[PDB]
């Protein structure tokens, strides 16, 4: 909508208070004009029609329980935008400040969230498996990252290319969580997964096998479920990324860690410069090796560590 930029205040899914950029014109809308061509958050009203209605509020205070998923979808989209801009010099998901749209209250008791090719979409969860999913900064960044991938590598969402697609979203979802520096970790979805169980998460990058996911190519899923295991076989790439950053020993192979920032630079360059729609694990290794070579030189520690990380997870 056309209006004036304003600043509201509210509470997120975890009950934390934060300021949000809004737009005033009769109502206060969840429309942040300070980032690119804007960040727009919508109410899906428990339906599956999209996007729903642009979120409107009478007083620019967002403290109702119904408000919480919207506050976080809006705020964390902002944080993700800032990460890509400040860290990778990327302006929104298309690199040309494309408007970012999210809908919350998607369907009834919906235990998921997704990027649909045009926007992010968040369920409220059923209160057992999930609470509203936009409450997870890694979840929001994971979904927005699918948009980045769509506009760059275009990794097909099936088999190995789909597993890379998924891992890329977990990698940058995590790097965004670290960027915001609020209880950061190498787990995925811990803030919104199973309100009844402490200490768990949907996936682990540090130890994928903790939640049933492979951490070595020899243990890769070869069947047809989950689009050829896109959220399963991502564990192999997540483990490699974790190793590149943090180092360690894994199946008797030692990796010298080079830190998160360098992990981010290498994978961002791989994604935007080398990967293709049909890239497999082997091609990701090469893309990452070449990226690290461009950035730090072929004889560098960074290149050596990428090679050791892929060695450790059995990807040549």
Task: Tell me how far apart the alpha carbons of residues 126 and 226 are, in angstroms, rounded to a whole number.
Answer: 21
181 binds Ca ion, rule: CB under 5 A? no
Give which of Zn ion, Ca ion, none residue 169 binds (C-beta under 5 to 8 Å, depending on kind). Zn ion
Catalytic residue among 74, 143, 160, 250: 143
Would residue 160 show up in a list of annotated catalytic residues for this protein? no
Burial call 60-80: b when 16+ CB within 10 Å, e when fewer? bebeeeebbbbbbbbbbbbbb
Beta strands 4-11 and 61-62: pairing type? parallel
With binding defined as CB under 5 A, does residue 17 bind Ca ion? no
Q: In whole angstroms, give the CA distance from residue 283 to residue 285.
A: 5
Give residues with Cβ within 8 angstroms of 172, minimum separation 6.
Answer: 83, 141, 142, 145, 148, 264, 267, 268
Per-residue contact flags (x/-) with Zn ion for residues 247 to 286, judged by CB under 5 A: ----------------------------------------
Q: Scanning residues 182 to 201, which ones bind Ca ion (CB under 5 A)?
A: 183, 185, 187, 193-194, 197, 200
User: Is 57 within any annotated ligand binding site?
Assistant: yes
Smallest separation (angstroms) from Ca ion to the CB of 77: 17
Q: In whole angstroms, how close is the CB of 9 to Ca ion at the nearest point?
A: 10
What CA–CA distance (Å, rounded) separates 19 from 22? 9
Geometric angle at alpha carbon 65, from 22 and 176, rounded to 5°? 60
Does the protein bind Ca ion through residue 49 (CB under 5 A)?
no
Q: Does 61 bind Ca ion (CB under 5 A)?
A: yes
194 labeled part of a ligand binding site: yes
Residue 278 contacts Ca ion per CB under 5 A: no
When the beta carbons of 159 and 204 are compared against Ca ion, the nearer one is: 204
Find out whether 177 is annotated in a ligand binding site: yes
**Within positions 148 to 187, which residues make up the interface with Zn ion, using CB under 5 A?**
169
Cα separation, 47 vs 149, whole angstroms? 27
Closest among 115, 123, 108, 105 to 53, alpha carbons compared: 105
| Rg value, the chain, Cα | 19
Return d(Cα 117, Cα 155) in angstroms, integer: 13
Site for Ca ion in 89-118 (CB under 5 A): none
Is 311 annotated for ligand binding? no
Among 43, 72, 138, 170, binds Ca ion (CB under 5 A): 138
Of these partners, Zn ion, Ca ion, none, which one is at the site of residue 197 (CB under 5 to 8 Å by kind)? Ca ion
Residue 178 makes contact with Ca ion by CB under 5 A: no
Q: Does position 80 bind Zn ion by CB under 5 A?
A: no
CA of residue 120 relative to chain centroid, distance: 11
Q: Which is nearer to Zn ion, 175 or 255 (CB)?
A: 175
8 Å CB contact between 94 and 41: no
- The entry of Zn ion, Ca ion, none near residue 226 (CB within 5 to 8 angstroms by kind) is none
231 in active site: yes
Q: DSSP states of 21-55 as a string?
A: EEEEESEEESEETTSTT-EEEEE-TTSS-SS-EE-
Q: Pairing state of beta strands 100-104 and 17-25?
A: unpaired
Nearest distance, CB of residue 83 and Ca ion, angstroms: 14
What residues line the site for Ca ion (CB under 5 A)? 57, 59, 61, 138, 177, 183, 185, 187, 193-194, 197, 200
What residues line the site for Zn ion (CB under 5 A)? 169
**Known catalytic residues?**
143, 231
* Binding-site residue ranges for Ca(2+): 57, 59, 61, 138, 177, 183, 185, 187, 190, 193-194, 197, 200
* Binding-site residue ranges for Zn(2+): 142, 146, 166
């Amino acid at each position: 909508i056309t209006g004036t930029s304003t600043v509201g205040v509210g509470r997120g899914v975890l009950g934390d208070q934060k300021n949000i950029n809004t737009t005033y014109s009769t109502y206060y809308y969840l429309q942040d004009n300070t980032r690119g061509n804007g960040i727009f958050t919508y109410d899906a009203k428990y339906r599956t029609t999209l996007p729903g209605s642009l979120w409107a509020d009478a007083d620019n205070q967002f403290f109702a329980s119904y408000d919480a998923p919207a506050v976080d979808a809006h705020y964390y989209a902002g944080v993700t935008y800032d990460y890509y801009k400040n860290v990778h010099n990327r302006l929104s998901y298309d690199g040309n400040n494309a408007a970012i749209r999210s809908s919350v209250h998607y369907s009834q008791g919906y235990n998921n969230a997704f990027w649909n090719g045009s926007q992010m979409v968040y369920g409220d969860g059923d209160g057992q498996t999930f609470i509203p999913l936009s409450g997870g900064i890694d979840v929001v960044a994971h979904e927005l990252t699918h948009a980045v991938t769509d506009y760059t590598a275009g990794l097909i969402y099936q088999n190995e290319s789909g597993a890379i697609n998924e891992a890329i979203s977990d990698i940058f979802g995590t790097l965004v969580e670290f960027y915001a520096n609020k209880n950061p970790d190498w787990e995925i979805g811990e803030d919104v997964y199973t309100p009844g169980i402490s200490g768990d998460s949907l996936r682990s990058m540090s130890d994928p096998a903790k939640y049933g996911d492979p951490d070595h190519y020899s243990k890769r899923y070869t069947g047809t479920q989950d689009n050829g295991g896109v959220h399963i076989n991502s564990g192999i790439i997540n483990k490699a990324a974790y190793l590149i950053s943090q180092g360690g020993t894994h199946y008797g192979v030692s990796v010298v860690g080079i830190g998160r920032d360098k992990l981010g630079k290498i994978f961002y360059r791989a994604l935007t410069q080398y990967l293709t729609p049909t890239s497999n694990f082997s091609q990701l290794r090469a893309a990452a090796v070449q990226s690290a070579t461009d950035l730090y030189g072929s004889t560098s520690q960074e290149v050596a560590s990428v090679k050791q990380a892929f060695d450790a997870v059995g990807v040549k």
